[PDB]
Write an enzyme that holds these catalytic residues in place. Structure first.
Site: not given
Lengths: 331, 331, 331, 331
Positions: D105, D165
């Protein structure tokens, strides 16, 4: 023929049997708060209400029925006869006495045991495979009673227990910390009553132990007086009773919470009344609240909470109190 | 430092000003059914309760608060003082006398007009831009009263009106036809009371006019006695009162239904009490139920229902009854 | 010995029959929109996904699973093998070819009939008592195909049909009138496709017939061009396909709508593909959309809509088109 | 007279201004999963979509609009022009490049910083008092970027961060323990990416510390390999990308979760990207995920989680990685 026949061509008819039926026994304030809460959470395809007071029963049923436009539970029935209860997945018992101002829940025992001798066999007759959720007080003893009377395996007899106490605890915790109760964690275990045990060791926000941050937490020396939060939990029922005559809404929501976990097989953890024989050195058939995994078979599992020696001492004390009354019973 | 300060670093003080606040005035059975219904539909970020009975008020608030874990309304407040009501989007008035067994709602008029003289100015003081939803009976006259007293534009004064009557009607329609009320259409208009008007011409399932299929529908000649359905609607309140002492759940759900349309600006159509001067040859400041478009400004529009001459005659009769009482109200 | 065993007890082990299981066959955009919609409406205690593309299938399952914290469906499974489908209450078929830009749904027939020859027997093998909801196109013919292949009674084979067309119709109706679609009524029946029939006679708001108000409604002479609303309904799919390549969200929601009525036994009325033989002078085994009562046994009843001679002519035309293809079918 | 005028008598004209508007910038798979999730949780009275691809944008809007019958969000708009965004309470940025299979990312940084230079000033122009929820990657750096560009106070710039997450973590925790994720607690903090930190010390069920029960938890020596649960969290995105090309549903639900807390002012605790300068010895303007209290003013408070020295070391490492990239950024 009839207007119905002019409008509608019928393929079938009875197409019967409820798939997700809930029965609420007792249409007192508690029963009806359970009913409305369950109706608005869409947990049931059929709701049955049972009581002995026939006028009140019919009136309650009708009031709910008139709101059918705004619900998604297509069948609401009531009756004195337990045949309206047939094929329930979950039967919630809220019938019985109920404590007045100043009255210990333990003082309801013999009156409500007698009531259960009538109720429980009738429930079991018509829904042998249901889960029993006991809400009537004293819930811990009456869960044991429902278990003895019904002959059900222990997983299918659940007392609402300290689900509400913990909810109150978390509300007050949240008030103090400026956090939504959903993000405040803390368990009140044991008797749903005066001998409840607050598990200070488990109290946390975002996984951060509050006792670690503040070792005085839960002691008398505590400058912040966190012990008072638990005192408020014990005294909640009495104070609400004092102010409005009874409690309804909180217990109603608490019960729908449990119903949701059972009906949808969530396997969420709730502090509910179950048999704890063999844990924490308890040797008798005592029921009290420990964290349990709740699903479509009722209580499938218990969490074995680690307790401080004092927390464990308090829980053994709760157990003793309860067993003292239990041993004297004709169940 | 406090536990809160040890645990949490603060960026910002005061979660300032509610964005979606609802006030319920009156914590009788109706008020609290409105409260629970609204709480469980997540329509408000803040709920305020107001009454004159201080013990009951505090008890009700606390009972709801203890269930906070299971709700998504983070702020519940109560008080005798209307300052707890400040910045409400919607204020629901349920306070006043309610009818006993056998008693016409119209018999409550002077008692509740007196009450409104206190309530309405106080509500307006603290929430000048709110919508007023009147539930107190007789709702049609009291909507007019709230309108006169408040000085609000007519779009912001709404009576719960025949939303419930229509709901009951559709429930009973559904029972007869074997269809969910959601798919059964039919309007009860006019007075929320004895002179309500069932619009036979509008009754339909899947767009199929029932009167077309069955021209006797609504008349005395009707072999199927559909008139009796409206019969049941008028008598519902009285029968429930007779059976359980009051009505609560249905009106509660009905009110949350209206609240939902207002708060979420849905522009759904509901039969609610509003000024109908200029329609159906009514020339006076009469409030009664006609289908209205409900949104964030309250009643933005009326549907001009087509009525049979008899249906219109019944509505003019309803109007006359109401105006007869309204004209006498120097308050 | 393990952490799990130290933490969690176990009263009850093997268990494992789903009570409210839904299977979605096909994890294309439509399948997954059905999946997410069903997951967020809490209609299932277990969701099974099946496809032939194994990588995509596992990826989709995992993506949904990672969001489990925010859902109330505890079991999500996928597999190429139909054994993951066992004991479904409802099986939604979305697999097959879908139409490209400019392509008639009727052009998918042979390709998707072949696919159904594989799918349907496998579904039936593992869930013999399920309801089949066909979404694959052409849905009306494929509903008939699923019926022939499965050997199910006709009540348990439902095509998504014109539920979406009617939804679109009501959206556009609402746009024109300034009313929420919920309060705008109007049915599109027949083929989910080019030959759909708008029932102008049934179009209403608050029970007020729009055709009564505006007799030109639905004709070419209509100054307001209401016929264009239906034209937009027919052209919706093609225009969305043109713009974004496929349709997903609307059909997904539409399917969850039907699923809700089936799973919760609501007995709501939906325009869905069914048997029609014997109505409106249709003599063949044609499936198309008429308003049906939907519940736990699927389609229990059909509403016999009254049609103008032209509306009926259009529906017979739709029937003929469909039967023309059906008669030639090669299983 | 027009049909509209025949049907509807108008009280009120302009109506207007949204009270609870949400904008989603970017109509990629992530944007649209956020949209559908928000639409089905009734968080908004108006949804605006913005993108640069005009065909796709209009198609997406239309698809959602066609499902309006099944939603309670009455206004859905889209446009290239940010004026469709005006008076948003919450603006969710999902636009930008997303990672390919194997791509960090952090590799998206300069591309998406450039994009933000256009997006953020335009959002701020039309909704100066909104909360910004950044979802675009790398979310932690881009939250910082949105903060610098917008000139907003830090409480009104929130990165979706490790909410997902942690959700994944709890899902996997639940899988292992046979408990619903809702009852499994554990935080993943720091970078939403490869350097995320699992807080083993905080992992618990029903308040029972898992590390206490199993001291090997989180180490390589762990017989049960709990470290693999975190490894699966890091690898989730990549594995889903590998299997289906992108992630959508989980992030969508995660974002709606955050939106719910903001819009309803819940003051729930979520691990989201915020400025952590002054905590854990971080001295720079680093944004990463720590547990934050989320409400109508965005992030009002941070929870100061207690970390093991190693957990803290990992978080400082995450901070360094991020600051390394942040310091090089130019405007």
């Amino acid at each position: 023929a009839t207007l119905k026949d002019q409008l509608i061509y019928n393929l079938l008819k009875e197409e019967q049997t409820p798939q997700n039926k809930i029965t609420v026994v007792g249409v007192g304030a508690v029963g009806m708060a359970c009913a409305i809460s369950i109706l608005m959470k869409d947990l049931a395809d059929e709701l049955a209400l049972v009581d002995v007071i026939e006028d009140k029963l019919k009136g309650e049923m009708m009031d709910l029925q008139h709101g059918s436009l705004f619900l998604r539970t297509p069948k609401i029935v009531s009756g004195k006869d337990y045949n309206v209860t047939a094929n329930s997945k979950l039967v919630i018992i809220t019938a019985g006495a109920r404590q007045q101002e100043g009255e210990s829940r333990l003082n309801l025992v013999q009156r409500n045991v007698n009531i259960f001798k009538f109720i429980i066999p009738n429930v079991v007759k018509y829904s042998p495979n249901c889960k029993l959720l006991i809400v009537s007080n004293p819930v811990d003893i009456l869960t044991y009673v429902a278990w003895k009377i019904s002959g059900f395996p222990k997983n299918r007899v659940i007392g609402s227990g300290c689900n509400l106490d913990s909810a109150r605890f978390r509300y007050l915790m949240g008030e103090r910390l400026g956090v939504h109760p959903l993000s405040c964690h803390g368990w009140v275990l044991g008797e749903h009553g005066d001998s409840s045990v607050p598990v200070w060791s488990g109290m946390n926000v975002a996984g951060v132990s509050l006792k670690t941050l503040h070792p005085d937490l839960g002691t008398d020396k505590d400058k912040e007086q966190w012990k008072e939060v638990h005192k408020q939990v014990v005294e909640s029922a009495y104070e609400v009773i004092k102010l409005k005559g009874y409690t309804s809404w909180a217990i109603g929501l608490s019960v729908a919470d449990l119903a949701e976990s059972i009906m949808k097989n969530l396997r969420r953890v709730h502090p509910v009344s179950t048999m704890i024989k063999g844990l924490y050195g308890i040797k008798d058939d005592v029921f009290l609240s420990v964290p349990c995994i709740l699903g479509q078979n009722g209580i499938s599992d218990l969490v074995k909470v680690t307790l401080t020696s004092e927390e464990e001492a308090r829980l053994k004390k709760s157990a003793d109190t309860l067993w003292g009354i239990q041993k004297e019973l004709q169940f």
